[PDB]
């Protein structure tokens, strides 16, 4: 799919994304915090439709993500993220999607997620996370 | 004067500010780089006029500031920044203003300036610098 | 087991650890780089013996770890690291151990591992990684 790179910010206020219980993760749009102000990054959309959107609006700054995990798996030959789970210091959001295949997890002992980059086609192909104090 | 805090960014593209050869530094407006895009921060203006504006547009990203220096001094009882000089890896910009009083200097051996905060009234009262790799 | 925390350093020169093809990972001892000099951290040993030791001596500083992965699994009711693989920008070291159970992976796009902390009893119970530019 088309690659994207939101770059780095000062935190995260909200994360909206698509998921399909049969296929995999779809589009993603993150609203970061930029020096105290909301900063909605560009919407990274799926090439297709038929998803369910989930909107995680974090209670910034008292609430932050302490772990991101999910499942990687092939869908029609494509290796994509099929499930996602966002755990914060207040609650867990997810899992959303198909929890089958290879699991992955990024627990954070100290530090903060401050950005996302990746690639999305029909589904979320892969993604990376910016970390910082 | 009124305090301001631009916060942190990914670099600096341009710095515009006022100076008066008799008094001190006036308003300041910085254009940062935010993940590859220009991001003009808010204009922090002087309460008064009668200044000369200087516009330093850096050749980002090949060009970056390697040292900031100047003079601190009293103007009508107020301790303010009276002179500023921005040295980059390509050239020196300044000094602009009154070079009398207590000198200060922030040479940077490794790292980058990624933000400015401070206070401006009739003149620039004081300021701080965000540093980061 | 007994917890350990090497803290942070300026890089990694060598990593020695035990593994058993039937059970799981055993002891671990890291030799870091501290401002250009070798710094052998304390040996975090298993409570038992019967392992095979592997010594990964990285070609510092031109060679560094770009990903750490492995498998988590229960061994006699204990959830422990059963397999480890260290991939550098020069080659892959591993996997060493039992590759069964839940996989985990820490690919690093940018940054460096500069420390290890965790807990070891009969086997490596769990561990964390210090990251830094």
């Amino acid at each position: 799919g088309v690659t994207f790179d939101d770059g780095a910010y000062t935190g995260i206020r909200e994360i909206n994304f698509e998921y399909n219980s049969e296929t995999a993760i779809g589009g993603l749009r993150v609203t970061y915090d930029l020096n105290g102000m909301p900063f909605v990054a560009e919407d990274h959309k799926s090439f297709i439709t038929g998803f369910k959107p989930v909107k995680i609006s974090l209670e910034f700054p008292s609430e932050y993500i302490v772990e991101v995990s999910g499942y990687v798996g092939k869908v029609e030959g494509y290796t994509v993220i099929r499930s996602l789970t966002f755990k914060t210091n207040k609650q867990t959001y997810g899992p959303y999607g198909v929890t089958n295949g290879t699991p992955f997890s990024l627990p954070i002992e100290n530090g903060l997620i401050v950005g996302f980059k990746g690639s999305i086609g029909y589904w979320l192909d892969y993604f990376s996370i910016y970390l910082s104090l | 004067g009124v305090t301001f805090d631009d916060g942190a960014y990914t670099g600096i593209r341009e710095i515009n500010f006022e100076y008066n050869s008799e008094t001190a530094i006036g308003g300041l407006r910085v254009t940062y780089d935010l993940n590859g895009m220009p991001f003009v921060a808010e204009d922090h203006k002087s309460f008064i006029t009668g200044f000369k504006p200087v516009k330093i547009s850096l050749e980002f990203p090949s060009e970056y500031i390697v040292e900031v220096s100047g003079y601190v001094g009293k103007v009508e009882g107020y301790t303010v920044i009276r002179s500023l000089t921005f040295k980059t890896n390509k050239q020196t910009y300044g000094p602009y203003g009154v070079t009398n009083g207590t000198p200060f200097s922030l040479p940077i051996e490794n790292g980058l300036i990624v933000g400015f905060k401070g206070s401006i009234g009739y003149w620039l009262d004081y300021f701080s610098i965000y540093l980061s790799l | 087991g007994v917890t350990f925390d090497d803290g942070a350093y300026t890089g990694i020169r060598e990593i020695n650890f035990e593994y058993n093809s039937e059970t799981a990972i055993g002891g671990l001892r890291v030799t870091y780089d501290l401002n250009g000099m070798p710094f052998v951290a304390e040996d975090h040993k298993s409570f038992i013996t019967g392992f095979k030791p592997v010594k990964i001596s990285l070609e510092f500083p031109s060679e560094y770890i770009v990903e750490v992965s492995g498998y988590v699994g229960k061994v006699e009711g204990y959830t422990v690291i059963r397999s480890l693989t260290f991939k550098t920008n020069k080659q892959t070291y591993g996997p060493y151990g039992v590759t069964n159970g839940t996989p985990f992976s820490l690919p690093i796009e940018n940054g460096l591992i500069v420390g290890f902390k965790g807990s070891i009893g009969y086997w490596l119970d769990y561990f964390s990684i210090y990251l830094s530019l």
């Binding site: 290796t79 990024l106 892969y126 990376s128 | - | 940054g111």
Partner: peptide
């Protein structure tokens, strides 16, 4: 190398 672009710690990607 050695430019004015702030560097960041990036982990991943996952999904390859």
């Amino acid at each position: 190398g050695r430019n004015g672009k702030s560097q960041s710690i990036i982990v991943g990607p996952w999904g390859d």
